[PDB]
């Protein structure tokens, strides 16, 4: 409750663009067309999870720019904000170093400014610490002669007087996080693509409150998602009843990715002792249907049964959400939880909707449903991640 994330942007366009990315990840987000004071006095900030402000400081001189930035960062911290994102130009225009030092110092003594202004979908990347626009350093482009605030140094570590890192080939977020901490208090991190940006955002998540990302629009949605994921509780439960090959391939992929999987035979599925032993034994869990029907029962007995067990697990142990494919499975899971329907929120991808259960014993639980034959191989992985990386209120 109350403001959790503060976004400080140096111009109006950037503030609005970054803020909508948080809205799109489920965060209740408030935007000031000026500074934060106005916003924080209002009792409507009790409501808001994310507060975005503009310092209108991009064309200002260093000491004036620094001044406005330190004052807003103080107000946000005073107000209970626990994550800070500083939104800058992808192409470095502004009192870049001045604002970064002022922000980091105001945030905390142990604060780390993690600087990566990449925005890959618009062609900005960070390469051995250099801000590239397409295939050239930014100082070889029009911005070296921006009428208002030219750019005169492309190598961000030189600009800031700091260290520089790049994720290694197969590096994990946790491994990357260790190296950023070692490079405190200010470090530039490379990124060529969204995958690189997401890895960095995850590392930043691992580092928690002390980690102050400094980025452009490229870092916005990844941070919205990672910080939302930190609020997910319990495993995502995935129930796969389809015998469509697409679903079996999708299940195989989710298992490959580390989901703990119950894959019983027809005989085991009808044996409550087998269920009991698996549940005792056990960020995703998967129940995988065998082909056919349970001995002595219904043509729909396998899905009905998986639905009932999934519901038992959600109520007894808890879950961050449920993903069900295909339609047979989704119907069985909702029926077992006595859900009337799904209040829609958004989607994983078109045809794979995300909502919350309405009615019944698990009202509010995030749910994703999908037809058995639908989607690419990674779609259940993506579905589970979608649940985790959305803020629900």
Binding footprint of Cl ion on the chain (CB under 5 A): 242, 326, 328, 372
| 342 phi/psi in degrees, rounded to 5 | -130, 125
- Smallest gap from Cβ 103 to Cl ion, in A, equals 52
Q: Which residue, 264 or 326, is less far from Cl ion as judged by CB?
A: 326
Instruction: Name the DSSP letter for residue 33.
Output: S
- Smallest gap from Cβ 292 to Cl ion, in A, equals 13
Q: Are 67 and 104 in contact (CB under 8 A)?
A: no
- Smallest gap from Cβ 273 to Cl ion, in A, equals 26
Please, which residues have CB within 8 angstroms of residue 295's CB and are 6 or more apart in sequence?
Answer: 266, 267, 270
- Smallest gap from Cβ 114 to Cl ion, in A, equals 44
- Taking residue 169's Cβ as centre, other Cβ atoms within 10 Å add up to 4
Q: Which residue, 101 or 328, is less far from Cl ion as judged by CB?
A: 328
Instruction: Name the DSSP letter for residue 72.
Output: H
Q: Are 3 and 79 in contact (CB under 8 A)?
A: yes
- Smallest gap from Cβ 346 to Cl ion, in A, equals 23
What are the Cα distances from residue 195, in Å, to 6, 125, 192, 247, 391? 24, 12, 8, 25, 21
- Smallest gap from Cβ 177 to Cl ion, in A, equals 40
CA distance 81 to 64: 24
Q: Which residue, 139 or 242, is less far from Cl ion as judged by CB?
A: 242
Residue 114, helix vs strand vs coil: strand
Q: Which residue, 203 or 333, is less far from Cl ion as judged by CB?
A: 333
Structure tokens at 309: 């067990």
Structure tokens at 92: 């470095």
- Smallest gap from Cβ 349 to Cl ion, in A, equals 18
Strands (E) located in the chain: 5-9, 29-31, 50-54, 83-87, 112-116, 124-127, 130-133, 136-137, 163-165, 186-189, 211-215, 236-240, 260-262, 284-288, 321-325, 341-349, 352-358, 366-370
| 133 phi/psi in degrees, rounded to 5 | -110, 115
- Smallest gap from Cβ 208 to Cl ion, in A, equals 41
Q: Which residue, 213 or 326, is less far from Cl ion as judged by CB?
A: 326
Q: Which residue, 10 or 328, is less far from Cl ion as judged by CB?
A: 328
CB-nearest residue to Cl ion? 326
Question: Judging by DSSP bridges, how do beta strands 352-358 and 284-288 pair with one another?
Answer: unpaired
Q: Which residue, 212 or 332, is less far from Cl ion as judged by CB?
A: 332
Q: Which residue, 71 or 353, is less far from Cl ion as judged by CB?
A: 353
Q: After which residues is the chain broken (C to N over 2.5 A)?
A: 282
**Look-up of token digits 């890895």:** 199
Q: Which residue, 6 or 372, is less far from Cl ion as judged by CB?
A: 372
- Smallest gap from Cβ 328 to Cl ion, in A, equals 4
CA distance 386 to 219: 17
Q: Which residue, 166 or 263, is less far from Cl ion as judged by CB?
A: 263
- Smallest gap from Cβ 356 to Cl ion, in A, equals 22
């Amino acid at each position: 409750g109350g403001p959790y994330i503060g976004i400080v942007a140096d111009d109006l366009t950037g503030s609005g663009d970054t803020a909508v990315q948080f809205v799109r990840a489920g965060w209740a987000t408030q935007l000031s067309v000026g500074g934060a004071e106005q916003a924080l006095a209002d009792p409507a900030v009790r409501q808001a999870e994310v507060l975005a402000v503009t310092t209108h400081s991009r064309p200002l001189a260093a000491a004036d720019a620094a001044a406005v930035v330190r004052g807003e960062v103080e107000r946000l911290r005073a107000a209970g904000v626990q994550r800070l994102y500083k939104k800058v130009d992808s192409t470095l225009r502004g009192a870049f170093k001045a604002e970064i030092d002022a922000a980091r110092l105001a945030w905390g003594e142990d604060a780390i400014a993690v600087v990566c202004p990449a925005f890959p979908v618009t062609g900005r990347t960070v390469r051995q610490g250099v801000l590239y626009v397409g295939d050239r350093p930014v100082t070889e482009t029009s911005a070296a002669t921006d009428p208002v605030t030219p750019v005169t140094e492309s190598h961000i570590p030189t600009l800031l007087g700091c260290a520089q890192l790049a994720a290694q080939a197969g590096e994990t977020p946790a491994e990357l996080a260790r190296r950023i901490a070692a490079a405190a208090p200010v470090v530039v991190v490379d990124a060529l693509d969204d995958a690189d940006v997401q890895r960095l955002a995850r590392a930043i998540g691992v580092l928690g409150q002390r980690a102050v990302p400094v980025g452009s629009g490229g870092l916005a949605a990844p941070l919205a998602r990672v910080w939302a994921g930190g609020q997910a509780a319990g495993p995502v439960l995935v129930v796969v009843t389809s015998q469509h090959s697409a679903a079996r391939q999708q299940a195989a992929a989710l298992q490959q990715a580390g989901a703990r999987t119950w894959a019983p035979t027809l005989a085991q599925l009808a044996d409550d002792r087998n269920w009991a032993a698996w549940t005792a034994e056990v960020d995703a869990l998967m129940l995988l249907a065998p082909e056919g029907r349970l001995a002595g029962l219904d043509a729909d007995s396998v899905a009905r049964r998986l639905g009932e067990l999934a519901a038992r697990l959600v109520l007894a142990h808890g879950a961050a959400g449920v993903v069900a494919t295909g339609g047979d499975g989704a119907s069985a899971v909702l029926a077992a939880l006595q859900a009337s329907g799904i209040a829609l929120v958004d989607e994983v991808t078109g045809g794979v909707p995300l909502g919350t259960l309405t009615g019944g014993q698990a009202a509010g639980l995030p749910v994703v449903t999908k037809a058995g034959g639908f989607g690419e191989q990674d779609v259940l992985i993506r579905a589970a991640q979608a649940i985790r990386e959305r803020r629900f209120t």
